Ligand binder design. Structure first.
Ligand SMILES: O=c1cc(C(F)(F)F)c2c([nH]1)CCC2
Ligand SMILES: [Ca+2]
Length: 223
């Protein structure tokens, strides 16, 4: 996250870190057994780390649970990033409490202008590289479809939305991939892609979660 703020320990209780020896992606806890992330975060050997603030220090609220199964969306295209969504099942159920909590799926899509919270352990620099230990947060509005398409000619599908600031300075960045965009207490987006970070007229692009609720529910119901 570039241009954000330190969230505070366990203030984003649905935020997960995906770890394969090191943090490589975020995700969102959606029930005691299941995490939503980006399809571009797929790999084998995932350990889900819940209750994290400093990802380099055991602070006492963590739960570390290996994935038993990952399910990349059937229509994910890794070239265009269309349908950039994945489900990860935990080997055991997380213990839910104030600091480890699921985030509600949307019942309706969110409109341009809606204020959201984006979070992660990604790069905090737009030029150069610095990776934080503690969770970073950014308040950002959803941008209009027309301004998203103007920013990225030929690249924005009906399964994507832009959020952020056309002036630049505030954005998600490398390592935030797969993490949450939460608006009015609902998971509306997944950190998907951009062009650099925090550049003028290049806001972050997010998977449009409301399009996937049926798939998420029926996948969970049978897996
Ligand atoms: O190179 C990147 C990679 C990402 C990623 F990987 F989706 F997090 C992002 C940006 N730029 C800006 C929005 C999120
Ligand atoms: Ca920790």
């Amino acid at each position: 996250i570039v241009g954000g703020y330190t969230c505070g320990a366990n203030t984003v209780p649905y935020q997960v870190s995906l770890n394969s020896g090191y943090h490589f992606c975020g995700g969102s806890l959606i029930n005691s057994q299941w995490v939503v992330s980006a399809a571009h975060c797929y790999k084998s050997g995932i350990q889900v780390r819940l209750g994290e603030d400093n990802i380099n220090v055991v602070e006492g609220n963590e739960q570390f649970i290996s994935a038993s199964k990952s399910i990349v969306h059937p229509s994910y295209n890794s070239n265009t990033l269309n349908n950039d969504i994945m489900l990860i099942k935990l080997k055991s159920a997380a213990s839910l409490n104030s600091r480890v909590a699921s985030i509600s799926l949307p019942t309706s899509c969110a409109s341009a202008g809606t204020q959201c919270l984006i979070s992660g352990w990604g790069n905090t620099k737009s030029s150069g590289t610095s990776y934080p230990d503690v969770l970073k947060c950014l308040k950002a509005p959803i941008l209009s479809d027309s301004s998203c398409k103007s920013a990225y000619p030929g690249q924005i599908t009906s399964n994507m939305f832009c959020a952020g600031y056309l002036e630049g300075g505030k954005d998600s960045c490398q390592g935030d991939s797969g993490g949450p965009v939460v608006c009015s207490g609902k998971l509306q987006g997944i950190v998907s892609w951009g062009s650099g970070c925090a550049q003028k007229n290049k806001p972050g692009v997010y998977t449009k979660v409301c399009n996937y609720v049926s798939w998420i529910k029926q996948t969970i119901a049978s897996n």
